[PDB]
Scaffold this active site. Structure first.
Site, short mmCIF file in Angstrom:
data_model
loop_
_atom_site.label_atom_id
_atom_site.label_comp_id
_atom_site.label_asym_id
_atom_site.label_seq_id
_atom_site.Cartn_x
_atom_site.Cartn_y
_atom_site.Cartn_z
N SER A 35 15.00 -6.45 1.15
CA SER A 35 14.74 -5.26 0.30
C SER A 35 13.25 -5.00 0.05
O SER A 35 12.86 -3.81 -0.15
CB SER A 35 15.48 -5.36 -1.01
N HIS A 71 21.74 -4.13 2.16
CA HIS A 71 20.86 -3.01 2.56
C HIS A 71 21.10 -2.56 4.00
O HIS A 71 20.44 -1.59 4.41
CB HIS A 71 19.39 -3.35 2.29
N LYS A 123 25.59 0.25 -2.99
CA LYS A 123 24.45 0.95 -2.34
C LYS A 123 25.00 2.08 -1.48
O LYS A 123 25.43 3.05 -2.05
CB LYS A 123 23.61 -0.11 -1.66
C1 LIG Z 1 20.17 -8.23 -0.72
C2 LIG Z 1 21.03 -8.07 -1.93
N1 LIG Z 1 22.12 -8.84 -1.98
C3 LIG Z 1 22.89 -8.79 -3.06
C4 LIG Z 1 22.75 -7.88 -4.08
C5 LIG Z 1 23.74 -7.91 -5.27
O1 LIG Z 1 24.61 -6.73 -5.18
P1 LIG Z 1 25.03 -5.95 -6.52
O2 LIG Z 1 23.82 -5.24 -7.08
O3 LIG Z 1 26.05 -4.94 -6.05
O4 LIG Z 1 25.56 -7.00 -7.54
C6 LIG Z 1 21.59 -7.00 -4.11
C7 LIG Z 1 21.38 -6.13 -5.34
N2 LIG Z 1 20.24 -5.24 -5.38
C8 LIG Z 1 19.84 -4.81 -6.75
C9 LIG Z 1 18.52 -5.49 -7.11
O5 LIG Z 1 18.15 -6.59 -6.63
O6 LIG Z 1 17.81 -4.81 -7.93
C10 LIG Z 1 20.72 -7.11 -2.96
O7 LIG Z 1 19.58 -6.36 -2.93
#
Ligand SMILES: Cc1ncc(COP(=O)(O)O)c(CNCC(=O)O)c1O
Ligand SMILES: Cc1ncc(COP(=O)(O)O)c(CNCC(=O)O)c1O
Lengths: 394, 394
Positions: free
Chosen positions: A184, A212, A243
């Site tokens: 991310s 992602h 997402k």
């Molecule tokens: C790579 C990755 N894996 C797992 C998750 C967890 O998924 P949920 O948000 O649906 O619980 C996120 C969350 N991304 C939101 C953040 O880090 O702000 C993520 O970016």
């Protein structure tokens, strides 16, 4: 009692400082649907900080599916899947996800976060090892920590460091490599061919987090293994619904024996209430739309390619992205907070990355595209970003 | 690669054995709303295994609130609260919860499970200590494990063992005691007066998990501190929305400084997508109903008192419950699986507790009441339970 607790939290002053300077831009209260423009404090703000890559949280068909599931099933299942919390529609969604990612079986979790906790906590145990990319998502670090295994980090996409670290390990132990598919921060893709080549040499299990990647890369959006053609070299495909799929919840897909072990051994599915009917239905309808309407992914990448070219032409310093995440380097924590707030006050929403998440000299804003953005909106945001980077003297 | 992974899961055969004997009753697929009767395989089944204590997942007002929030806000917020995932209605719900439990501030999480992970993982650190009741919920054990503190279990409601274990600890360290308010297994209540008395002596923080207490005990259902009048001796009140509140999500409420620290330091709120609009709205409307309609709690306890008296009169061996959880001892794992499945096949849903969760000689079925149950339904379930305990020779 609060004496020691008060001392534990006493040194945390960055939020009081941001608020007192008028720079605070966390927990911004949105008043409208997540969309290319949102309402904050009664005014319109361009949204370039979302994870709704395909713009589907406002699809009338998806809202209607969710509303119809409330009518039929109510507001909640009031228990774990394990006990009284399983609906026919949860099983339907597992079957459809398994087909979509090319695996035998899947198990839902109520969040993406909890989808990582499940397999990382229960497959590797005492005398075993988990190998993590050092940039892996917090939920992966936390999942691995809940295991009784030894957790080893390797350098970001560093296959020599992965290979060496695996070589050091006793042969009579189990090993599991877990990586983000798309990372991310910088929007870069794992070296899955080399990582799976190494995994196959040391008989390590491979788990990919496609939070992602789903709806972004792979055939009809099926994710990272699909992108590389390496379905047969990845044991477990994790995903979230929050997402591209515009909902809440997640999954892990794999061989029916491994999935059966997970659904009876992962504490985060045995001891947490199941997804709401509305979220199962919304996820089912989004998944149908992503596959049957190739437009969405196409338009996401037209916007990504357009915005990336426009940022590079305006002289912005971008990270090594291969995704709709455009990291724009600022390289000062103070400047990053200031740029973020000034953009907010001028009608542009971006997400900052600052210390201690990263070194000060790697601080940046993340500008994320949505299939539903227009070139006009992109142009307006970049116009405003040039102006704020000038005001800030970056 | 699967060689070692296949070996790790090779010894897990209880599910294959239950299925082959025709005894399997986990993940039972429900086809209808969670209610006093549910549809499984086209047939009607009495539900005595739910956590919807007030029967509110079918309240038309709560369904309508959720459907109206989908219409206004869409299917999801597509980010963490921390970034792009906060709505005005999340803040509204925090304000209403803080008022309900008598605290300055609250922070939502997307699950109850994640509500425990947040404060347990980030408040106590290196050189600090977490003291846990040995029967505390899995999410509390997992939260504490995510901390960098030393986690110490004390005997179930054993205040001498808590006191001794705290006495051993260095004075220049922080300590946090976390307990369930009502324990789900036996339905018993924490000794909060003594635990808070000890906490005050050693200046330890006190956290209570009110998953099974909210909507059940306390003034207008406000939970365990409220039940004992000890709001001022409890630092943090955790709750879920998945039980009485008929939704998904949870919270932690406390002093505004502690809550502000949590919302910027707890990985399970910073790095997980926020609650769906439908779940915020459903939780807001359930919370209004629990407070404005005392009937629901009243009828829950009329059903609990009626069913408990009827079970004791029929000679069932009950655990030390003080709640709508009626633990019925069986004291054989084989008999527990058999009784569970035979009840299912005769139209009664109960939840088994078996090894390794408990010793074989403490295996039981949990029979949980709902405000919406009738005495006729209770009578029919107990009639069927007498018959199956005879068939099983308990
Ligand atoms: C790579 C990755 N894996 C797992 C998750 C967890 O998924 P949920 O948000 O649906 O619980 C996120 C969350 N991304 C939101 C953040 O880090 O702000 C993520 O970016
Ligand atoms: C005491 C307790 N605390 C926390 C939670 C977690 O809340 P959510 O289910 O809303 O994530 C539960 C879940 N009870 C479900 C079970 O253990 O089967 C619980 O029983």
């Amino acid at each position: 009692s609060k004496g020691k607790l008060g001392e534990k939290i006493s040194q945390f002053k960055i939020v009081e400082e941001l608020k007192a300077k008028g720079l605070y831009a966390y927990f911004r209260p949105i008043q409208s649907k997540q969309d290319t423009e949102v309402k904050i404090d009664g005014r319109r703000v361009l949204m370039f900080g979302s994870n709704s890559y395909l713009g589907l949280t406002t699809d009338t068909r998806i809202i209607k599916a969710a509303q119809d599931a409330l009518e039929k099933y109510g507001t909640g299942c009031a228990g774990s899947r394990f006990l009284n919390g399983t609906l026919d529609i949860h099983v339907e969604l597992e079957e459809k996800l398994s087909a979509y990612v090319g695996k035998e079986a899947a198990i839902l979790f109520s969040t993406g976060f909890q989808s990582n906790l499940g397999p990382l906590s229960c497959l590797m145990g005492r005398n075993d090892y988990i190998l993590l990319d050092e940039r892996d998502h917090a939920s992966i670090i936390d999942g691995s920590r809940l295991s009784f295994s030894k957790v080893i980090k390797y350098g970001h996409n560093n296959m020599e460091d992965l290979r060496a670290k695996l070589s050091r390990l006793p042969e009579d132990s189990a090993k599991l490599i877990c990586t983000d598919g798309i990372f991310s921060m910088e929007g870069d893709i794992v070296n899955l061919p080399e990582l799976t080549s190494i995994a196959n040499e040391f008989d390590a299990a491979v788990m990919v987090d496609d939070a992602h990647s789903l709806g972004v890369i792979g055939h009809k959006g099926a994710g990272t293994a699909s992108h590389f053609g390496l379905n047969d070299d990845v044991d477990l495909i994790m995903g979230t619904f929050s997402k591209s799929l515009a909902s809440l919840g997640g999954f892990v897909a794999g061989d029916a024996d491994v999935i059966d072990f997970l659904k009876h051994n992962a504490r985060s599915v045995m001891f947490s209430a199941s997804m709401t009917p509305a979220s199962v239905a919304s996820t089912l309808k989004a998944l149908e739309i992503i596959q049957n309407e190739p437009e969405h992914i196409e338009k996401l990448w037209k916007n990504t390619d357009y915005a990336k070219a426009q940022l590079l032409d305006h002289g912005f310093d971008l990270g090594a992205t291969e995704s709709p995440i455009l990291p724009i380097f600022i390289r000062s924590n103070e400047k990053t907070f200031w740029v973020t707030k000034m953009l907010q006050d001028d009608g542009v929403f971006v997400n900052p990355v600052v210390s201690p998440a990263v070194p000060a000299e790697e601080s940046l804003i993340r500008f994320s595209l949505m299939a539903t953005h227009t070139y006009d909106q992109i142009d307006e945001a970049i116009e405003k970003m040039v102006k704020v980077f000038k005001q800030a003297e970056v």
